[PDB]
Write a protein that binds this DNA or RNA. Structure first.
Ligand SMILES: [Zn+2]
Lengths: 198, 159, 245, 88, 136, 49, 98, 49
DNA sequence: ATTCGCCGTGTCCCTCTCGCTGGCCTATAGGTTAGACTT
RNA sequence: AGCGAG
DNA sequence: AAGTCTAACCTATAGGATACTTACAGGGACACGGCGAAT
């Protein structure tokens, strides 16, 4: 209500926003060099836990500043789709198709996206469009990393659906399971017995 | 109200048989529950004699009602608009009312419209159910070989 | 204790919390909004149609029209804005009802909040085509349109395998008949019972059942299934081409 | 391989675009590019897209269930109510 | 094999649409009966590639001689079946969305960069409070 | 006699079915499968040089 | 509202539909139909509705203590749990040794 | 319990005097539980003999 | 009341490898598609 | 879910 | 046998008017925040 008062009285000459678009706008109208110089000044004249916080934030910002990678790539306008064979859809048993979980997450993102596009086109009160944007946000979060925020999106059986990040963490991830050790052809095994004449 | 073994009409269920009136002294008063049985699944109902007429305890109509409903189902020209919702709700209400004339009118209308085109899935089930209850009460009133009852019902309805 | 102040200051402080549950959050987003009055809704609709006619009249007279008076232009722009805000307020009042009727298809297929938003769209269409000339309750007319929209969206977005809407209809019909037939007889109904029930040859029920099947996520446990899912001919083809050589 | 060439288009936001075909074919007027929206040639033909009128619009919905005169009456009622609100 | 470097870095939306061979629009995976991927779906052949080697959706192309040619009616590039394993899709968001990792991972890199705090960021991004982009 | 008979244990593979998400060999006697050359084995090989 | 109520009583079991060997062969699940007396009562006026409702095919323990599901033979292993109740546990805190 | 939930939901939609215990009772919860318990459970263990 | 220095509490990633066995209801316009004759 | 080797 | 020539089928869209308004371990470690002296 205070926001509504402030805008409807003095909406002009100051810009307010909500959500990821607001954060993207905030990043755009911001100079990395100014923040880096300020951090350098504070550490030049800081002390204590203020010093430590300055050091950490300076690391974070100088990561972007020293390199040519700008931070605008943190906020996403388009999301990539892993190819199909890494996202199987194959029939099995009695011809019953058995896809993976990424299809559900991608489908949820797509559903939210189409609904949001339509809604904006028709023109709806800010409440519903905010709700749809929030849905898209939490769904992209589940897609990229399920369980990291909100609730673990659980498919049937209350099982948390595997997300793209999950294919990295832990043993079952790609790294520890199919790169640092792989099944091999031209191989076998059997039980062993003492061969003293050998 | 009724003695033992009487035939009773308890809508929307229709025909039923009474066996006794057990007076359940529950609530400090012997509730003369007329124990009643139906044919669908042998369900048992205990109807207070104090309010038996209130809940719909009654008798099958005499032959005067039979001829009245014959005339009702003989009458053509019952119109209807293009939609479906109006008749669906109307026949729902008039079948839940436990009446003989209106159930006959609606079942006649639905029969003729089915014979014309064929309407839907569940309305065929309602048509069947209405025909079954009408045949049951006809056999109850006449005691006329309920298979014969449905045959004659079809014969007069076709006209 | 109402104006106990402290007792309402606690409520205000509790209103400003983080809260992460989106269903609870939206429960409170419509929390701020209230209900509506039937006659008030009639006047709301009247204002909506008036502002609509005003904006279309602007658009028509925008081409080779007239230089409208400042007062006339101001008032008609205000009527149009009033109509927009009127429909926003009306939708805000109806969010509660649509949520209350959308809670009845939860636990299946898709997210409850997803059901909510599809129902909200159905509500927008309902107000888009609401007729108050007879002057009846808005909600009773609306329920049909919201249910239409949510059933459509459920059908279009139910399964990973896309099936046409007609097939969604025949499948949920098959399921309902199956359920009630079991409830009555207690024996598994044979496919021929369904075939004669719908008056079809003894194949449609089989195809519809096969379509009705839900895909099984390759992720499973007992270990996921995806691991366990499946050079003579390649070597042979190279060799045969050489043999032709 | 087969005699093959590349058809030319450009999407709306400037980026000149290009997709291959064979020589023996019709280089179509319209194509949905890799960027993700329809585009046409800078070569000739110019097949005059001629978009269809929108599916639906709130006005025509009110039209088939209402007329001009009563809506005019509502407009006048609102106008006089607001005129009384401002100046009386 | 000529490898020297894996320079991972932030991928801007421009790069995301640069990789993409097409753009999946609708959430349609496979047809109910013919068991074929839809058009503009999550598996559409035109986006990722042909599901069968040396074929196309309408199937007028089957020989190998005209390899590397995309059909007319259905617009599927005639390539290997395995090319689907590599070609990548993308989706255009109606409204921008924040990468979960940088936002939520402790310490919140987004918050540290923008001087903001974790709960505060959770509030702004998930539509619980407003933020001022700028003021003159 | 315990139920660990060799005829159910022995197994070799030279070319058998391969998984589809990753083209590594399957694993298990019910299929052909290979034998998981895991991480500790790789450390052993690196140690030998 | 409380103007009507529902209740159940008298759970009865019928004879086993097929003999143990038969069910083991033909994949049938050795089980018995379960019937219960369901009673629906109206409180606002006073009514009863008594029925014998079919509550499923309850699997039945064979003579040897093994269930037969889908032909296969299965055993329900006894579980161990912590009894619900009240538990007073004492712990020594190292911060002040108390 | 799920049975009770669904029937309590049903009593609101159904009109009084137009309902019979057959209508109130939908077995789908209970049996499902049993079917879901004997198959796919951590204690209905496959008989080892 | 802010600064700075301490404590204090809450929320999160990690703890061996390799085998084997089994387990609603229509109405309509436009897209789409079946079959059949032919030179 | 159960089991074998350390 | 593809090329027409003929004749269906199938599906995205849309449309109907009582009433009904808030779901359903543990351990280590670091970062976000209590308690106290100083200006
Ligand atoms: Zn083609």
């Amino acid at each position: 209500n205070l926001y509504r008062e402030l805008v409807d009285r003095y909406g002009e000459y100051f810009t307010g926003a909500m959500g990821a678009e607001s954060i993207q706008k905030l990043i755009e109208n911001f100079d990395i060099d100014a923040e880096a110089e300020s951090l350098r000044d504070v550490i030049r004249n800081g002390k204590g836990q203020k010093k430590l916080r300055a050091l950490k934030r300076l690391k974070v910002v100088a990561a972007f500043q020293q390199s040519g990678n700008s931070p605008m790539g943190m906020v996403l306008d388009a999301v990539p789709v892993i190819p199909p064979e890494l996202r199987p859809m194959v029939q099995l048993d009695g011809g019953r198709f058995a896809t993976s979980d990424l299809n559900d997450l991608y489908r949820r993102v797509i559903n939210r996206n189409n609904r949001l596009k339509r809604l904006i086109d028709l023109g709806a009160p800010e409440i519903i469009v905010n709700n749809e944007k929030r849905m898209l946000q939490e769904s992209v979060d589940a897609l990229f990393d399920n369980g990291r925020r909100g609730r673990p999106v659980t498919g049937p059986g209350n099982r948390p659906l595997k997300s793209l990040s999950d294919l990295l963490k832990g043993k079952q991830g790609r790294f520890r399971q199919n790169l640092l050790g792989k099944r091999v052809d031209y191989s076998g095994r059997s039980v062993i017995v003492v061969g003293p004449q050998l | 109200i009724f003695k033992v073994g009487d035939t009773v009409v308890y809508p929307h269920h229709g025909a039923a048989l009474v066996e006794a009136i057990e007076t359940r002294t529950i609530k400090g008063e012997q509730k003369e529950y007329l124990v009643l049985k139906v044919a669908q699944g042998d369900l048992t109902v205990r109807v207070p004699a104090e309010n038996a007429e209130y809940v719909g305890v009654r008798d099958v109509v005499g032959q005067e009602g039979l001829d009245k409903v014959f005339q009702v189902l003989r009458a053509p020209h019952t119109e209807e608009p293009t939609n479906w919702s109006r008749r669906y709700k109307a026949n729902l209400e008039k079948l839940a009312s436990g009446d003989v004339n209106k159930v006959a009118e609606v079942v006649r209308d639905l029969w003729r419209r089915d014979q014309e085109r064929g309407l839907s899935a569940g309305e065929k089930r309602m048509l069947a159910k209405a025909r079954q209850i009408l045949v049951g009460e006809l056999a109850l009133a006449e005691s006329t070989d309920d298979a014969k009852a449905e045959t004659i019902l079809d014969e007069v309805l076709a006209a | 204790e109402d104006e106990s102040e402290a007792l309402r200051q606690a409520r205000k402080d509790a209103e400003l919390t983080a809260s992460a549950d989106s269903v609870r959050a939206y429960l409170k987003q419509i929390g701020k909004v209230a209900l509506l009055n039937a006659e008030e809704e009639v006047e709301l609709a009247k204002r909506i149609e008036a502002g609509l006619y005003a904006t279309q009249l602007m658009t028509e007279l925008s081409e080779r029209g007239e230089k409208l008076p400042a007062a006339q232009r101001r008032d008609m722009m205000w009527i149009c804005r009033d109509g927009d805000r009127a429909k926003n307020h009306l939708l805000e009042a109806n969010l509660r009802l649509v949520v209350s009727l959308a809670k009845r298809y939860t636990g299946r297929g898709m997210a409850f909040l997803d059901l909510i938003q599809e129902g909200n769209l159905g509500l927008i269409r309902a107000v888009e085509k609401f007729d108050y000339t007879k002057g009846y309750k808005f909600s009773t007319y609306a329920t049909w349109w919201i249910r239409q929209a949510i059933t459509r969206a459920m059908a279009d977005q139910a399964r990973t395998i896309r099936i046409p809407v007609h097939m969604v209809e025949v499948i949920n019909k098959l399921g309902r008949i199956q359920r009630e037939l079991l409830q009555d007889l207690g024996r598994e109904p044979t496919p021929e019972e369904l075939a004669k029930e719908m008056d079809i040859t003894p194949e449609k029920v089989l195809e519809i059942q096969q379509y009705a099947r839900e895909p099984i996520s390759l992720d499973q446990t007992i270990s996921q299934l995806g691991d366990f899912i499946e050079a003579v001919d390649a070597v042979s083809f190279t060799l045969l081409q050489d043999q032709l050589q | 391989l087969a005699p093959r060439q590349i058809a030319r288009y450009r999407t709306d936001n400037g980026e000149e675009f290009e997709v291959p075909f064979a020589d023996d074919a019709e280089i179509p007027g319209t194509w949905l590019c890799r960027n993700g929206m329809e585009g046409t040639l800078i070569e000739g033909d110019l097949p005059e897209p001629k978009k269809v009128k929108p599916p639906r619009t709130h006005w025509d919905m009110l039209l088939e269930r209402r007329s001009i005169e009563e809506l005019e009456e509502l407009l006048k009622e609102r106008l006089e109510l607001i005129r009384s609100r401002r100046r009386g | 094999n000529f490898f020297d470097e894996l320079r991972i870095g932030l991928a801007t939306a421009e790069d995301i649409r640069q990789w993409s061979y097409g753009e999946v629009k609708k959430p349609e995976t496979i047809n109910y009966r013919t068991l074929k991927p839809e058009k503009d779906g999550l598996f559409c052949e035109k986006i990722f590639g042909p599901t069968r080697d040396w074929e196309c959706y309408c199937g007028k192309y089957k020989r190998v001689r005209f390899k590397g040619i995309i059909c007319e009616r259905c617009g599927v590039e005639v390539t290997r079946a395995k090319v689907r394993r590599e070609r990548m899709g993308h989706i255009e968001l109606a409204a921008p969305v924040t990468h979960i990792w940088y936002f939520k991972g402790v310490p919140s890199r987004l918050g540290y960069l923008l001087d903001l705090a974790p709960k505060d960021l959770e509030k702004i991004i998930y539509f619980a409070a407003y933020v001022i982009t700028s003021v003159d | 006699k315990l139920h660990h008979l060799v005829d159910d244990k022995i197994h070799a593979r030279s070319t058998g079915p391969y998984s589809m998400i990753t083209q590594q060999p399957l694993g298990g006697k019910a299929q052909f499968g290979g034998q998981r050359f895991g991480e500790m084995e790789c450390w052993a090989m690196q140690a030998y040089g | 509202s409380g103007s009507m109520s529902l209740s159940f009583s008298d759970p009865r079991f019928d004879d086993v539909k097929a003999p143990v060997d038969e069910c083991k062969d033909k994949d049938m699940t050795y089980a018995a139909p379960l019937f219960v007396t369901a009673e629906f009562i109206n409180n606002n006026t006073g009514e009863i509705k008594s029925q014998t409702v079919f509550m499923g095919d309850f699997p039945m323990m064979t003579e040897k203590g093994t269930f037969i599901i889908n032909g296969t033979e299965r055993v329900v292993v006894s579980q161990l749990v912590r009894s619900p109740g009240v538990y007073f546990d004492e712990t020594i805190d190292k911060s002040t040794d108390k | 319990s799920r049975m009770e939930r669904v029937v309590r939901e049903r009593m609101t939609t159904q009109d009084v005097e137009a309902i019979t215990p057959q209508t109130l009772i939908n077995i789908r919860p209970v049996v499902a539980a049993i079917k879901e318990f004997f198959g796919t459970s951590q204690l209905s263990q496959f008989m080892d003999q």
